[PDB]
Amino acid sequence: KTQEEHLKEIMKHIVKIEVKGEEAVKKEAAEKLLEKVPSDVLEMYKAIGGKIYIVDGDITKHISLEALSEDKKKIKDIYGKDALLHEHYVYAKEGYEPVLVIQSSEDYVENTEKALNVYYEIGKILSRDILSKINQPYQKFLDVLNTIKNASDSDGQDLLFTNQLKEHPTDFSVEFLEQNSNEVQEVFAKAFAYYIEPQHRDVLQLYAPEAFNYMDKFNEQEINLSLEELKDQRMLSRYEKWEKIKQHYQHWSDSLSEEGRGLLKKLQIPIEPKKDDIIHSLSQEEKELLKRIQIDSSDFLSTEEKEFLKKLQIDIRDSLSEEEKELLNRIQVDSSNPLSEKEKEFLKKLKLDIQPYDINQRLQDTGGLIDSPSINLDVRKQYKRDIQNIDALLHQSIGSTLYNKIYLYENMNINNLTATLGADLVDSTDNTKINRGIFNEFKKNFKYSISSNYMIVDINERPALDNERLKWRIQLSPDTRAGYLENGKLILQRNIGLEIKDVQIIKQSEKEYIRIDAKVVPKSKIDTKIQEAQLNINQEWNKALGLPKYTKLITFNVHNRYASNIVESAYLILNEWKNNIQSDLIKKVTNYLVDGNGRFVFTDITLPNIAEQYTHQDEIYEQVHSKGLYVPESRSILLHGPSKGVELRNDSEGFIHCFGHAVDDYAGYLLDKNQSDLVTNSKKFIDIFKEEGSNLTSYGRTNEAEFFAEAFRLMHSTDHAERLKVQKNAPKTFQFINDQIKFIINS
Numbered sequence: 001k002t003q004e005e006h007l008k009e010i011m012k013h014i015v016k017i018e019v020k021g022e023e024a025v026k027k028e029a030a031e032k033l034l035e036k037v038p039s040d041v042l043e044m045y046k047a048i049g050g051k052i053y054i055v056d057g058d059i060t061k062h063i064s065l066e067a068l069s070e071d072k073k074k075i076k077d078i079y080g081k082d083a084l085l086h087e088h089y090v091y092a093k094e095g096y097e098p099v100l101v102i103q104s105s106e107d108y109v110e111n112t113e114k115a116l117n118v119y120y121e122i123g124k125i126l127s128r129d130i131l132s133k134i135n136q137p138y139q140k141f142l143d144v145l146n147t148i149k150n151a152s153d154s155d156g157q158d159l160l161f162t163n164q165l166k167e168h169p170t171d172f173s174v175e176f177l178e179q180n181s182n183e184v185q186e187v188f189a190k191a192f193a194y195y196i197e198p199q200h201r202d203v204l205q206l207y208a209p210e211a212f213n214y215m216d217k218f219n220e221q222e223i224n225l226s227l228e229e230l231k232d233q234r235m236l237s238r239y240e241k242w243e244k245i246k247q248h249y250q251h252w253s254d255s256l257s258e259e260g261r262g263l264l265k266k267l268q269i270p271i272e273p274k275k276d277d278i279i280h281s282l283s284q285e286e287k288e289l290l291k292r293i294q295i296d297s298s299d300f301l302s303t304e305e306k307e308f309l310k311k312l313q314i315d316i317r318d319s320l321s322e323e324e325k326e327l328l329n330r331i332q333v334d335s336s337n338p339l340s341e342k343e344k345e346f347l348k349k350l351k352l353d354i355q356p357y358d359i360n361q362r363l364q365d366t367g368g369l370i371d372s373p374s375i376n377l378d379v380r381k382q383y384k385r386d387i388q389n390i391d392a393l394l395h396q397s398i399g400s401t402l403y404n405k406i407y408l409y410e411n412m413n414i415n416n417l418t419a420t421l422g423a424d425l426v427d428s429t430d431n432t433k434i435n436r437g438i439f440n441e442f443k444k445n446f447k448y449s450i451s452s453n454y455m456i457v458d459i460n461e462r463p464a465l466d467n468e469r470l471k472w473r474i475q476l477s478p479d480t481r482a483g484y485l486e487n488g489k490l491i492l493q494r495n496i497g498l499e500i501k502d503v504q505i506i507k508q509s510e511k512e513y514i515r516i517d518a519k520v521v522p523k524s525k526i527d528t529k530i531q532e533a534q535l536n537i538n539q540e541w542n543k544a545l546g547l548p549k550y551t552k553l554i555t556f557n558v559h560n561r562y563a564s565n566i567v568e569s570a571y572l573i574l575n576e577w578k579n580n581i582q583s584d585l586i587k588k589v590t591n592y593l594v595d596g597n598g599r600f601v602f603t604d605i606t607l608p609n610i611a612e613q614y615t616h617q618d619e620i621y622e623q624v625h626s627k628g629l630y631v632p633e634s635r636s637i638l639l640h641g642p643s644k645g646v647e648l649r650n651d652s653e654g655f656i657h658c659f660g661h662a663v664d665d666y667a668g669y670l671l672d673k674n675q676s677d678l679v680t681n682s683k684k685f686i687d688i689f690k691e692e693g694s695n696l697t698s699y700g701r702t703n704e705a706e707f708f709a710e711a712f713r714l715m716h717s718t719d720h721a722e723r724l725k726v727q728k729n730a731p732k733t734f735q736f737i738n739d740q741i742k743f744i745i746n747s
């Protein structure tokens, strides 16, 4: 009866009968007709100012449809056969003041033909009058249309298509759907009708199963999100929602201190480095070294950082002028492009000091592991104080008596999730369309997400920045804690859990975006999934490599918004790895690793924050962050997913490159089993690098190990051509490596 109530409330509100004889049997008859339509499509019609009129005799003879034009007075039935309006039993008047007219009859229980037509007209209202206001149907329903057209049995077409669509060769492109607006809306109406009229439902499932499934899933679940999105379009609706939430947090807001307000503020605007401070905290000796070191010569500083640094030299220019040029004039050419040890150390210490104070970034980088010793102790503690405090400020949950389900919105840049994919998300030709191919890949294994920092969301959806093609629709839990912001936003507590309920391409303001429907759940529920996954992937590969049953080789250090993908991609990476390297080369090397308690860490927090690396660092500034990294001391391969390595097709290439470094380790172990050195450091190799140390990837031209690793990787790619490349361009190395693989396999 939870449903029953909702009906009459709305029905007697939008539905008005006007008959002759006893209006008890006639009303209860027409009511039996509407009760079969999804409760929500009735409320969406109310929203756009629609009303339903049940009358006797000719329908054209009614107040509303009175001002109707003579021309259109010729509508076709569900089967597309003309029939004049003053002779029909239904009609849905379009326009910005929607009206629905139906003749009185109870035989609808028998005459399924009329009922099917009434629902047809209604479906027409849903697609043409309602959903169009929120750019629907779109790609999803479009896919159904194509599944239906190219399918084997062509009956599904004869059932829902018109000869207009029946003749179109190629699939229906997004553009098609745009210029053929009414056509698509038509199919929707017909599918809706057949699915709603109890008697024709089977015919739909028989000839057009995909269409049945779509309307089935739409009418049961997804219909409510449509209502929600339609409401989001309405002024009074948006401000009524914002006000209840504001009211709910009024006490909390009214008690916020100035200190509190200040904390929330810097959470929104990071503090940038003060050029002044920088210099001062240098050193009488150091300042000397910075006056002319070239920041452009570094390979560990982002241009972003470089630009800033060089602007510090320029600000030291004071006394004894002559110096200025003797330095500018004595360092540029005869000194050259190359490098310098002692001073690069200086730049690595400065990198740390010139990072902006960004609380959210810190949580994201560390996955919430705020004690990570990846930055100087002084700032680490400052971050910990502000964080602990923010956790205490956002204590009140969203649950209220003023409302039930509540959706909050977040616009996001895809690079923040997967840079490697964000490179081709947008269509290169037309920047307003989404590359369907990347879409499917991105969507692939995206089942759950994690928030380790403080998410900032909008109460009502708002337009995104140019580089934000991701639009999240999140259903909060009444348990979720948050803070209210005057500008119509909420700051959510850290360590939230998110299940991905749906992912689809949607149009808005002439551009396409990726709508992500998510539901907030306990972070423990997601973590448990990750942990069961780790257990699974280890049993599986322990068996494939012949390792003791309970060894801990593979580890998931997952804490961010693309969580599920890090886990699932790990399986795929390890596969390209075995199917591209000598099964016996793997075993000896990983066995060696396991002996040293090594690990294969797949993570989404920055590498400087993985213990497998930081616990073996002499100095903090010596840390390294990148796509992949091999650590000899811990004997582990670290792979950071979110990133995009310097032109390396995928994560696999990256993982393999690191395994290369591992080989250079074991092989180097076999030579001087009495010492700890790399076979890549051997003289016999130093020379080869002096000759072929340029015949490969620009990167390989960095140094010994790097060269060996890149060569190794190529020699194992999936594109066999790349294997030959080293063959015909780095012969010396090719052999050296293949000798190395034997010198391990056999020993």
Ligand SMILES: CNC(=O)[C@H](Cc1c[nH]c2ccccc12)NC(=O)[C@@H](CC(=O)NO)CC(C)C
Pocket: 299, 300, 301, 624, 625, 626, 627, 628, 629, 630, 643, 644, 645, 646, 647, 648, 654, 657, 658, 661, 699
């Ligand atoms: C964004 N990912 C990248 O392309 C960075 C770039 C980089 C080089 N040196 C650095 C020092 C500090 C921070 C970043 C870098 N490099 C890497 O990931 C390389 C890491 C490596 O050589 N591991 O053994 C693997 C290589 C095949 C891409």
Ligand SMILES: [Zn+2]
Pocket: 657, 661, 705, 706, 709
């Ligand atoms: Zn390397």
